[PDB]
Ligand binder design. Structure first.
Ligand SMILES: CC(C)(COP(=O)([O-])OP(=O)([O-])OC[C@H]1O[C@@H](n2cnc3c(N)ncnc32)[C@H](O)[C@@H]1OP(=O)([O-])[O-])[C@@H](O)C(=O)NCCC(=O)NCCSC(=O)C[C@@](C)(O)CC(=O)[O-]
Ligand SMILES: NC(=O)c1ccc[n+]([C@@H]2O[C@H](COP(=O)([O-])OP(=O)(O)OC[C@H]3O[C@@H](n4cnc5c(N)ncnc54)[C@H](O)[C@@H]3O)[C@@H](O)[C@H]2O)c1
Lengths: 425, 372
């Protein structure tokens, strides 16, 4: 059961006790989070190069999430407030209608084998296509362990660029079926093995043999349904909020400026889940924004419609190059424990959850922005950080300043003013 | 002096000692990195909502970096290897030619005030422009502390969208001059106060009042120069490596698949610096990629050319909405120390370094990919 009552009122330690009993975590697992230093310097020094210490970030747990009828706790690591509060509130609403319905495609990654110096790119392209099975088998022979797990190179698609500054070039794509692995290193290795053979055929000089972060073959999808009666507030009507959201969606669909902020909100929920599981967050961001820019126009990643039934329906489909047997994933003690809380068995399981959180996150920001400003809920949480920006000396009184300025007028302009009300006359 | 000989051979602790003496950090400061637990739970439970613990990431320091002739240590927080190794190697090469030369624009952020329900968007647009000074003064009157610091609302630019699924809409942009702050919260607040007046004028219903992460008015720039003799290996010649890089650049400029990877490289260097400084890494990512997609085609953020002199020249211009007086920046003990190591006095100083690292990171990746 993901629903966690009065969880936000529980102290950090009390919450960890609750999550421990629920999940049935060992006392060894609970200590990794209770006691600082879960990451030993010898391990930390192994990942990065010039390691001198370790940097910490809050590690939270969102709730109410239901992916395909199965409840699940979502661990997040971020520094910005409201993200978890929002993500959980929206997941709570989705519960009433069956939670989040997700899916995904076969984990297909692609390697790029760039070839320059060919005077006949177009003719050379066919030569590679006829000897496709020959190149495929060469790629698989490299990684035998992958073929046994059910993965392996599947097909090859060759593309050309005749009008190029540095001249025409041929770019072959190896469509590799990795799995439970982001597959960066696996695909990159296959591209190296094939390079020689492709030069033998096209007669050009292979340059780059790297993968592509724009994983448009490895998609993850998520769906939500929101009844107007659920969004119904005191000042606004249920159907009124739906239209507001729809106006906000259209806006993000036509204006790239709003789309960048709209897509940023989606990553506010996805990125923290990636950092927790020890996955590459930059790879995820790169595949996301580039995908939003596929139709020659930067736009929304999520869609918001109003079905003929009158309910708000949203979706999120985007590349999700995540893993389970990755590098820092098996290495970092907490990245390992995060997958244990999630209960994921495959990488695609992780991707389906990642898009669900993103979708939930976007709906939350939009609902807020369409109801009445964003400063009402975000600043209430951010009332602590901003208290530090004003409190010069004697940061003890910051706690009290936060409770006073929380009267719907929270801002540094007022935070500096409330200081005199206590320090003097 | 940023050059740190045999630093990679030193023990993490030995390194912390060497950075402590160099910078002249107190034993209080050094202890933040030596002993785990720099971030107390009571502080950690203050930032996020359902906090139950704290996640740790390696905290490194890159060397050789020279921004405008001033040396500087760059703190980075990431989990992927080679990033620091590459960033530092390339910076080492840049030194020979003067290091990295940077610049930036006035820190300008913009808020969007979307207005629906106007039967005459185009006409309403002029009414807001004529009463521009009147809406401006209203936004400033809100944040008094910003005006004293030299900030505040500067101008307003109204845009229209007649062909929209949900109908025509008017969108006003408040060009605010924040400073030393990412300005997300400052801008969004000015947009709330102004909303009432804009409805009074246009006669429409204001919907969203949020900022825009695509900060194309708050740009940061970096330049590098690399002599062929420097890239000259044993197997490859100097000039040969130059042509390889140029071939790689052209590839990223025309194909969106290579561009996504090319740009990811640039982010491998910038994000770690942002996480360390406690800045919003998602805001930087959104502004970066959206800016790469401005010309209706996703391409390179960085540029690589071969001047009439024969040297490889590269640049990186992009939005950098970063800060010093932000939320988690003033709260996280290590975020604060990171700025102290950097020695930056303004946000624009931080931004300039940020794009410098990005540019270095990309050069490194391309060189490797181009060599073998
Ligand atoms: C934060 C709320 C939900 C206020 O919440 P509220 O409307 O005041 O309602 P509430 O507090 O009475 O709601 C209670 C329920 O909400 C949840 N909840 C509520 N607070 C908490 C909390 N503190 N800690 C844990 N859970 C919380 C919690 O699940 C709880 O369930 P129950 O207690 O009944 O079991 C809200 O105002 C909101 O929707 N905020 C949206 C802000 C957001 O999305 N921020 C993320 C970043 S967005 C960004 O950076 C830029 C942007 C916005 O432009 C991006 C974009 O446009 O996409
Ligand atoms: N990225 C987004 O889409 C988005 C949207 C909303 C909020 N946020 C979050 O808001 C935070 C950043 O917002 P912020 O930095 O504007 O808010 P902030 O409240 O942390 O700091 C700005 C406040 O400090 C005051 N101030 C004091 N010294 C200042 C100085 N030297 N220069 C400028 N202002 C000074 C200003 O008057 C202003 O009220 C980030 O955590 C970000 O994640 C992000």
């Amino acid at each position: 059961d993901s629903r966690l009552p009065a969880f936000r009122n529980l102290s950090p330690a009390a919450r960890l006790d609750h999550i421990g009993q629920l999940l049935g975590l060992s006392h060894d697992d609970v200590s990794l989070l209770a006691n600082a230093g879960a990451l030993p310097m010898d391990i930390a020094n192994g990942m990065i190069e010039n390691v001198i210490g370790t940097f910490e970030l809050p590690y939270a747990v969102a709730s109410n999430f239901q992916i395909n009828g199965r409840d699940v706790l979502v661990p997040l690591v971020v520094e910005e407030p409201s993200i978890v509060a929002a993500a959980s509130y929206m997941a709570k609403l989705a519960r009433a209608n069956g939670g989040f319905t997700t899916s995904s495609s076969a984990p297909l990654m692609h390697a790029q084998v760039q070839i320059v110096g060919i005077q006949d790119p177009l003719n050379a392209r066919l030569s590679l296509l006829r000897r496709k099975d020959e190149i495929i088998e060469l790629a698989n022979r490299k990684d035998q362990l992958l073929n046994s797990l059910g993965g392996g190179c599947r097909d090859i698609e060759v593309h050309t660029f005749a009008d190029t500054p540095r001249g025409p070039m041929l770019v072959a794509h190896l469509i590799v079926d990795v799995r439970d692995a982001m597959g960066a290193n696996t695909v990159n290795t296959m591209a190296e093995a094939v390079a020689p053979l492709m030069e033998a055929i096209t007669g050009g000089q292979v340059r780059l043999r790297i993968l592509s972060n724009l994983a448009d073959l490895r998609l993850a999808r998520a769906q939500v349904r929101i009844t107007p009666q659920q969004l119904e507030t005191a000042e606004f009507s249920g159907e009124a909020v739906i239209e507001g959201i729809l106006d906000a969606y259209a806006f993000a669909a036509v204006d790239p400026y709003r789309a960048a902020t709209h897509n940023k909100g989606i990553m506010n929920g996805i990125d923290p889940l990636i950092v927790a599981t020890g996955n590459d967050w930059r790879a995820v961001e790169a595949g996301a924004h580039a995908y939003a820019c596929r139709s020659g126009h930067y736009g929304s990643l999520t869609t918001w419609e109003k079905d003929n039934n009158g309910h708000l329906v949203g979706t999120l489909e985007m590349p999700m190059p995540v893993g389970l047997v990755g590098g820092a994933t098996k290495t970092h003690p907490l990245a390992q424990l995060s997958l244990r809380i999630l209960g994921v068995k495959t990488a695609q399981a992780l991707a389906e959850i990642a898009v669900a959180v993103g979708l939930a996150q976007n709906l939350g920001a939009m609902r807020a922005l369409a109801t009445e400003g964003i400063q009402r809920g975000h600043m209430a949480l951010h009332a602590r950080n901003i208290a530090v920006v004003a409190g010069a000396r004697g940061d003890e009184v910051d706690w009290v300043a936060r409770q006073l300025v929380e009267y719907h007028d929270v801002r540094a302009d007022r935070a500096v003013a409330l200081l005199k009300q206590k320090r003097g006359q």
